[PDB]
Design a protein around this nucleic acid. Structure first.
Ligand SMILES: [Zn+2]
Ligand SMILES: [Zn+2]
Ligand SMILES: [Zn+2]
Ligand SMILES: [Zn+2]
Lengths: 200, 200, 200, 200
DNA sequence: GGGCCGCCCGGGCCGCCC
DNA sequence: GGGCCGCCCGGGCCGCCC
């Protein structure tokens, strides 16, 4: 069986999709999302709000998992991890293992997992339905390396795969988006969108 | 579950809303409220009158809680607290813990709380209905740091979240407003309203 | 007896004077010295090289002490200390008490002292004569607060007093210089020198 | 006493000086030396031949030590070491500790040392006099990180300090040169020499 | 050899003195 | 009320792809 998790969109029977805030492209905005590229541009260790939208209410005990894979076929089989420099940084919140790229902040029930067969990292929180009058629930993710980090992602693009899973382990829905963690998200989003228009 | 309290307005079945006095924008007025920005501008440790308005009378034992959160997504998970300088100031009224930003003055039944899971501070008083002939009840809040304080809010905007809660802990209503604690509330309100008009 | 150490220059029988490197006034240079003002401009926690020049060799066991006092008569009696914010910072090198403003880096025999009568802080290293062919010895000082720090120096200028002391405690020589610890030493040096010329 | 080794040239009673090969400035030459800058430009882990020249023959048991320090006063006190990424690389020759920046290749009597007081690294070989008819002896040094390495030198220039020491520990001579380890030594030497001419 | 991403840089934007 | 210091900001400056 494959050791590479699927990235295939599966909005499923609950109508699961992601949403992202409108942030603009000021040069050093902390986080911004390109709909044309389905790509988040964000700064190291800065809050990245991701909205969970469903048409139908998931069952009690549903979980939300996030995991990173390399986007390019050439690198898919390599586990996405923090680089050695940032791994040794004294920046752990007391729960995230220092090797994990993706953290969740602001959640009292976060779980960090290492797959015993694929060695891949993931971070899980319970799914909570929106407040009355609200249409979505927001998770604050953090990416703890730049895409460029030597000895880590080393300029290779990643996908974040968000899965909605019931307590039994059934896949209720899947979505994914590309991530670039970089110093100047607004500059780099504009550059990549312009290159898409000019040369894509 | 989230460690960030919701800011979502919930005027609820009792028709709960806040009111603020008309104060003007003389440069150093002690407290002034901008309806356009839903924002209070006030000076450190000065009285900030907040009115509670309801259409229907809350049940006996209802309580009024105030808590601060950072407004920006990037800072929401950080607990709002006093800076180290003002924390060591001998300005405690004998009841407020020195780390708490928000105090209530002039109430014999004030309670200061530290959440055992989120570590967030709040201050609670009993809800009292208006006097006959009066349409609202007023609480005098104090903010014990400037928004700019180094090692505390450090120029980051906060929201104050006011909740009306029954004795059992049900949320009866919720309102919130932005706060800037600053040396010159009248100047800064005018500046922010003008920037809204010109560049918002 | 006075609790304020003397600032009076005493170059003494060994011909003791200080020297400073030529650094220029690029806006954010880390450290720069104004001869006209006898004033060092430097950034928080950045190396400040100070040269010790003597005409005659001090005796074995000579010590070099540095201490800060407020320059203005109105503040001389207050002990110069780190502000509460930086005092709680996890920036101690394992030897300097967190309250001390002045540190010495790169010396295996540094001693930090608190005066039991005046409560004033000082930092001492052994005097070592220059290498053959060299005319001076250099100490790397660090200032661990900005001059502007709220709850610390709070925009008040300080003097650093450097004393050459024999092992018995005799004062062999004294020199002093003004210090401004600031974000932009080059800007601020130029500003202060221009104000001296225009308005001094 | 200082934890920073002296860089002061001391050609001494044996007339000790260094020599470097003429290599040119082809863009990616592996190693090239700028006399104007007293600076070696070389690639990671590539051979850097350094010549030892003496006028008088050192005594038996003389040793040659190489050590790196940061050139800028602001960084002198920090120990120069390999970055975390290259430290975990399986590139050890069986003798050099993985944390050491400077290695010697091609010598059966190399010794790697960690100073118990300063924690600084050095690498030592016995001094051997030139062959009859030869005027110098050559040591092949290797630098195991780029000057730019994140978490290591991080774009900060270093000096290599070469000391000639007798077996008793007397300093017989000292020389030093700046090093830049980089991808394109020929480009970067030309750039730095041109900037010296134009803006130095 | 030509040329394409983190960070440095001078310009300019909130408590307190007058 | 007028006006005088830390930090944000867009412009632009080294390993690696071609
Ligand atoms: Zn990293
Ligand atoms: Zn404060
Ligand atoms: Zn301070
Ligand atoms: Zn390296």
């Amino acid at each position: 069986s494959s050791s590479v998790p699927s990235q295939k969109t599966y909005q499923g029977s609950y109508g699961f999709r992601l949403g992202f805030l409108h942030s603009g492209t000021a040069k050093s905005v902390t986080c911004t999302y390109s709909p044309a590229l389905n790509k988040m541009f964000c700064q190291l260790a800065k809050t990245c709000p991701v909205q969970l939208w469903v048409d139908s209410t998931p069952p009690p005990g549903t979980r939300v998992r996030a995991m990173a894979i390399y986007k390019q076929s050439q690198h898919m089989t390599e586990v996405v991890r923090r680089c050695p420099h940032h791994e040794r940084c004294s920046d752990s919140d007391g729960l995230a293992p220092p090797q994990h790229l993706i953290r969740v902040e602001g959640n009292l029930r976060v779980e960090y997992l290492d797959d015993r067969n694929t060695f891949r990292h993931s971070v899980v929180v319970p799914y909570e339905p929106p407040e009355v009058g609200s249409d979505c629930t927001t998770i604050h993710y953090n990416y703890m390396c730049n895409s460029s980090c030597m000895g880590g992602m080393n300029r290779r693009p990643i996908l974040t795969i968000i899965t909605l899973e019931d307590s039994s382990g059934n896949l209720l829905g899947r979505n994914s988006f590309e991530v670039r963690v970089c110093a100047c998200p607004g500059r780099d989003r504009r550059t990549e969108e312009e290159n898409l228009r000019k040369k894509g």
